[PDB]
Design a protein around this nucleic acid. Structure first.
Lengths: 96, 80, 104, 93, 96, 80, 104, 93
DNA sequence: TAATGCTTGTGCCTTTATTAAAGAGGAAAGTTGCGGTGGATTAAAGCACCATCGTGCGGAGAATACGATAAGGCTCTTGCTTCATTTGAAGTTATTGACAGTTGAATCGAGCCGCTCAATTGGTCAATTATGGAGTCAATAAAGG
DNA sequence: CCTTTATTGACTCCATAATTGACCAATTGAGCGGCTCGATTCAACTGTCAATAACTTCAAATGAAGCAAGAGCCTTATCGTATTCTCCGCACGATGGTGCTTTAATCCACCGCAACTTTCCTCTTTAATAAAGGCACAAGCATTA
């Protein structure tokens, strides 16, 4: 059949995803995760839907920024693949 | 509600990385990202729950989340 | 019966801004010219942001302004990005920016 | 309960800026939040300025200095020029 | 005569300078630099001495933190020598 | 007062780096550090000059510098 | 004539803290229990910081507390460093920390 | 003019903590400025909390919530415990 | 391993200056009375969150071949450290002048409080048109030859 | 450079919901007046910042080796990637229950205002002792053998 060389489809996905503004994490798993996380603070908590949506948007924006910093760190080391040490370095420099 | 952090699947992390301009992703990036996201969510949800508790309420609204995000210098527009 | 906004040549509710300043208890007393100055500054900032957003929408061949265009206008400008460095815009997306080394 | 926003004035400013360009409701929400945030920033800066010098009144000078402290560079210069023009026009009337 | 191998005296200086708490930039050149920098904003400015001392302390602390971040970036790239690209990367990640 | 940024000599930059834990230093680090320091000083001195201008004064005090530093999230103790 | 600090079992000036709260115009009315709570919290924080600084001074075989010891105590503790992440201590120096790679 | 500070109270607290350890004047300056900063942070947070719910009075609840929002973790928990103890001791006396 | 340079920490004498200690007053804290404005309580209703249920697909999960990138190792050369010499500018002392920051009073300008009235603005309803979705074409771009 | 195939902007046609306009309530901005206070100006005084000058002298500048670390190139392997098949749980539409959020009225309780008294902290002054400086000495670390 027909096969693309590695990295071409990744470049196409990079081009496509930055054009759109929709959310990337599935809504129900994130809602379940947020509910479980909040259960550690007070039991019997009800979440207004807009609160969950705001949390999802903030988390996605934070992760996108963190991945931009991770890409910068990985490029600095003459690599194209991001690694956990890049995330750790970016978070450490950011002050987290 | 146990082990729901696994609900952030690999395609979701890959899509988030692609939105950030990442070309190649390693193997343990998924676990590292899940840990980082859990820490961030824990902090923000703790602040939101405190803001809710001060009002003697039982339902977390969007305003509490907005205030909690603003407390960390992460102001969000569109949910006022 | 001339509104203070019309007296000062503005479109921003000078009276409402004065009431906001007085109700917020920011100070014991509030001068007569402080709301006018605040209204002028707010109107100028809104006009600048709307100018940039409308230009970004026009380059996109769209006749309406959407949060994507506002995000593009904010992140394309230097001083606005300085003022809005930590701001996250709902449904805004990101600026397309691929590193040179990643390209083939 | 009635809610108070800057939607009408933002629409008027936009029609002054772009005669033939509309706007969406989400854009109104974002613009209103942005204007409110700037208002709070300037107000707290002016309150701090008044507290520092033990002056119980916040005049146009406090607003101008808060603008200079908050807004960066040419944005601050243009904002100060517009505010001074508006205050002068108000006082001359 | 007697010569040390490279890097030993550098390690000794690192050990020595992290123990003490005095200032490391000469005071008079920094005062002149601050006066020249302030001359661009408003002329005929007079500086109280404590203001200059506070500025010097803040600048030295900022530079020490920046050099710590730069050293982290340089170590991340399998190097021991800090380079201008390390400073640029650290400042970019910090948000400056 | 011209070309006084050269008053930050090489030994001063080397000592600052050694205090920060740097083992070896390149050649252009001195120019890069001087530029960074100039930017930081410009920002802080601009804020301090605005603060002292508001109070109708002409001598910059320590309180103005402390306030300018605090406005950047760089609070300083010992000069209150 | 019993001082409120003695009434609440504290060492900090409850009356002075109430006067500060009233003078600062943080709100039009201030409760009776708010200054007591604030004084207790401030006294606890001061006691904790002084405890850590005194321990750091004792490990240095010194009989007095100096800004170097305060900086060491702040940096060696996790929660205080989190509260004082951006704080610059005058004449505090740095916490000694050399990277493992730089060692011979 | 008279300059009020926390020097005497900090000295009393230190003598409670370390009976045989002295302190320096610079340490007093640093501690006094640190206490002033913490007081300011807690007061502004409490004022914001009161403004959010339209309550014109600052009570012990507002201070407790400000402490929980500002101080981290076990530090916040211990501070809340001490504050509650002091408030109950004051009210029961 | 080992002698030797050698820089650092140890230990004692001095001294000074930085901290320990006392009084006047004066500025502020505790008392008491008052009263009205805010907070806790109670009652209701309505709306938004929760949970069940069917479904039917598009997105997630797993296998497979693989080829491209990360990593290790060798070379080399050039950039950065270390040490000896010399000087040029910083730190300190002592002096002086004059501008600038504080404090106190008068007072005239100005913003708050109270009530009125009138008019701009906001929630609700009716509407139409740019925008979203479906389907197709032409332009764009990538991979083996 | 070329051909073939996969991908996406452009284009049109249809649905739609989302933005635009009118009404009418209803909340609040402009007006007018009195009044107490504050911020403006004037004036002396005093605090200290800037400027000069000389002296020392140690840290910065410069240069001559010294040498080892960054970088380029080659080789290997192993691991993220694209593609195909399978299934699974998610997003959506409907429905019902209920609790908990919000609003309205009441009663009570508690905190700001104000004068008074008293009381505790804060400059000014006096003293003293512990850390910095200096001098002498031990002692582990590095270096080439």
């Amino acid at each position: 059949p027909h096969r693309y060389r590695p990295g071409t489809v990744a470049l196409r996905e990079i081009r496509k995803y930055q054009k759109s503004t929709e959310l990337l994490i599935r809504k129900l798993p994130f809602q379940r995760l947020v509910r479980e996380i909040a259960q550690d603070f007070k039991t019997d908590l009800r979440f207004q839907s807009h609160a969950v949506l705001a949390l999802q948007e903030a988390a996605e924006a934070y992760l996108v920024g963190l991945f931009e910093d991770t890409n910068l760190c990985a490029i600095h080391a003459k690599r194209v693949t991001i690694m956990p040490k890049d995330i750790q370095l970016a978070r450490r420099i950011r002050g987290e | 509600l146990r082990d729901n952090i696994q609900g952030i699947t690999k395609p979701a992390i890959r899509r988030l990385a692609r939105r950030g301009g990442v070309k190649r992703i390693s193997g343990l990036i998924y676990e590292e990202t899940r840990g980082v996201l859990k820490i961030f969510l824990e902090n923000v949800i703790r602040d939101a729950v405190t803001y809710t508790e001060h009002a003697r309420r039982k339902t977390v609204t969007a305003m509490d989340v907005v205030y909690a995000l603003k407390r960390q210098g992460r102001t969000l527009y569109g949910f006022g | 019966a001339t509104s203070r906004s019309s007296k000062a040549g503005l479109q921003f509710p000078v009276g409402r801004i004065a009431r906001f300043l007085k109700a917020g208890k920011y100070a014991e007393r509030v001068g007569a010219g402080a709301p006018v100055y605040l209204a002028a500054v707010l109107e100028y900032l809104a006009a600048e942001v709307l100018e940039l957003a409308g230009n970004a929408a026009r380059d996109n061949k769209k006749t309406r302004i959407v949060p994507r265009h506002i995000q593009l206008a904010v992140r394309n400008d230097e001083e606005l990005s300085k003022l809005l460095g930590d701001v996250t815009i709902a449904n805004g997306g990101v600026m397309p920016n691929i590193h040179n080394l990643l390209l083939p | 309960k009635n809610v108070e926003t800057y939607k009408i004035y933002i629409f008027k400013v936009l029609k002054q800026v772009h005669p033939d360009i509309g706007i969406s409701s989400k854009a109104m929400g974002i613009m209103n939040s942005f204007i409110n945030d700037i208002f709070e920033k300037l107000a707290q800066e002016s309150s701090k300025l008044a507290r520092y010098n033990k002056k119980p009144t916040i005049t146009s000078r406090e607003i101008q200095t808060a603008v200079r402290l908050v807004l960066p560079g040419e944005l601050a210069k243009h904002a100060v020029s517009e505010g001074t023009k508006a205050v002068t026009k108000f006082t001359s009337s």
